[PDB]
Amino acid sequence: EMQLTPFLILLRKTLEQLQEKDTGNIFSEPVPLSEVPDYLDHIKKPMDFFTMKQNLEAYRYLNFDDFEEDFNLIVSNCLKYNAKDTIFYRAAVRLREQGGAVLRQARRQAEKM
Ligand SMILES: O=C1CNc2ccc(C(F)(F)F)cc2N1
């Protein structure tokens, strides 16, 4: 029951804060199938922050949960594909932790609207 423009402004800010936690920029673009050619064998919906930005501006995120679901996909795809003893897996754990705090505060702001 809120206005669209401030909500999208909030999602844009939140997406930027989430990208800021991905200091290695390993989640900024789709996992490159050129370097990971079997990635799609068990990853049924790849996700990344560039795709999320495209989805945002295409008005595909009209509630907080749909935005957060695609963030969670970035994390879960990485935990699924990569072995636990890899930098990639640990980076997804850290993103889940740091991004979770970003999302909780952003959702508080959206609920104020
Ligand atoms: O799960 C992931 C997360 N992103 C990523 C970037 C680059 C590469 C690679 F280019 F292959 F080094 C692999 C991955 N795998």
Which residues have C-beta within 8 Å of that of residue 62, sequence separation ≥ 6? 4, 7
Q: Which position has the token pair 């609920």?
A: 111
Find tokens 């079997």 and name the residue: 38
Phi, psi of 90 (to 5 degrees): -70, -35
Torsion of CA 83, 87, 90, 96, to 10 degrees: -110
Name the one residue in this structure whose structure tokens are 């879960």: 76
- Secondary element (H or E) of residue 74: helix 64-81
Structural domain boundaries, residue 88 = 1-113
Going from the Cα of 33 to the center of ligand 1, the distance in angstroms, rounded, reads 9
Tell me the best of 40, 49, 88 to mutate to test the pocket of ligand 1, counting ligand atoms within 8 Å of each CB and taking the most: 88
HSE, CB side, 13 Å, CA atoms: give it for residue 58: 8
88: Cβ below 6 Å to ligand 1? yes
Whichever domain contains 36, its CATH number is: 1.20.920.10
CA nearest to 73, candidates 96, 103, 56, 39: 96
How many domains does the chain fold into? 1
Residue with tokens 């920029």: 25
